[PDB]
């Protein structure tokens, strides 16, 4: 039936791809990333970063940090990783499941920082990425000010619990807007290659710090 | 803009005025469905009398409650939280069942609470003979007991007491909810409740 195909976590994404992973054993110094379509994109756009690396990319387009607690256990804690990458909230503050609430949106983040830490998973908080606006959802007016104070608190909670925080933020922001660069935009919230290699660089660092 | 997919809605306002009244020593947190939420419904007292705060949700399957788990419980600083859940998995409500998942989230909520100093209590499932809503499921009572078998077994293993209501309240071959305790089959009545109180209370008791 429709009714049973339900699968709002879309936990089906990956199924498959952790089972073959999990077939093949531990691995050493595995990091997952956790995102949306900026971190399904990183893949799609410069597999060689995560393959070069022992990165495994774990993002789903159109997902918001509610989808990502839901996959966490699968899509992270199930993998044995040492380090997880968690990139969310874009697509809170684009409204894609409702309303945004950053209470909600905070305390889904703290809740995946608790459980990896609870598998004894290291964990790197990033920033929410520049939008002067989502394209498909012209509504959300103030953007910017949403993406800010999200990032104000994942940053100072990182701080209070010793977990290092990557601003690629303040690298790719621009104008008083506070748009993504165009240099390395084409619609405003996605990175092109360009804009993912400013990221690799600092996730890179950071990563090699912890590891 | 209207979506809520975990029905954070439902307690918000509720929870907001318990965060005002400020924390309560030995505040108990009971996260189900409409198990649950009937309980509150059926004897009011029961919890208001004891300091335990209700969270059911009707319909809700365990990936709701690790949805609602941090606003739901966490924010209420409760000393232990019970968590009853699994039925409305097994009867699909939120598509194909997958035990893995199931229990995943249970696990998942446990390491939550532990991480912020809540205690635990976990519970079996209740018995069904079957769920009429759903006809498709026709092995209700056999993934109810192998849930149940498989909570019981981390309870064990990780030192947190496990409440036990189906072997109270299971009757016949079938493996149905006692006549006695139910009338749709699924959901208790009072005299249920008042069975599921006896248990629960006692392990509380003993938790705090
Ligand atoms: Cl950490
Ligand atoms: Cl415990």
């Not at 699968?74 to 969310?88: M, R, S, T």
């Not at 503050?93 to 004894?120: C, D, P, Q």
């Not at 790197?124 to 104000?152: E, R, Y």
């Amino acid at each position: 039936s429709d009714a049973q195909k339900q699968d709002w976590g879309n936990l089906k994404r990956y199924a498959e791809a952790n089972k073959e992973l999990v077939r093949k054993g531990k691995q050493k110094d595995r990091v997952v990333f956790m995102g949306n379509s900026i971190t399904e994109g990183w893949v799609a756009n410069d597999a060689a970063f995560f393959e070069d690396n022992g990165y495994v990319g774990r993002g789903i387009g159109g997902q918001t940090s509610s989808h990502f607690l839901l996959r966490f256990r699968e899509d992270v804690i199930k993998l044995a990783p040492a380090l997880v990458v968690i990139n969310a909230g874009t697509n809170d503050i684009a409204e894609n499941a409702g309303a945004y609430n950053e209470e909600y949106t905070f305390g889904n983040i703290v809740s995946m920082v608790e459980l990896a830490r609870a598998n004894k998973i290291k964990v790197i908080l990033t920033s929410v990425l520049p939008a002067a606006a989502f394209g498909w959802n012209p509504s959300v007016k103030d953007a910017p000010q949403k993406i800010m104070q999200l990032n104000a608190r994942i940053r100072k909670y990182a701080q209070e619990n010793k977990i290092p925080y990557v601003d690629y933020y303040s690298e790719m922001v621009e104008g008083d807007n506070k748009a993504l660069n165009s240099s390395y935009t084409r619609d405003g919230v996605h990175p092109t290659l360009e804009g993912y290699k400013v990221m690799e660089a600092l996730i890179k660092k950071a990563i090699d710090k912890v590891l």
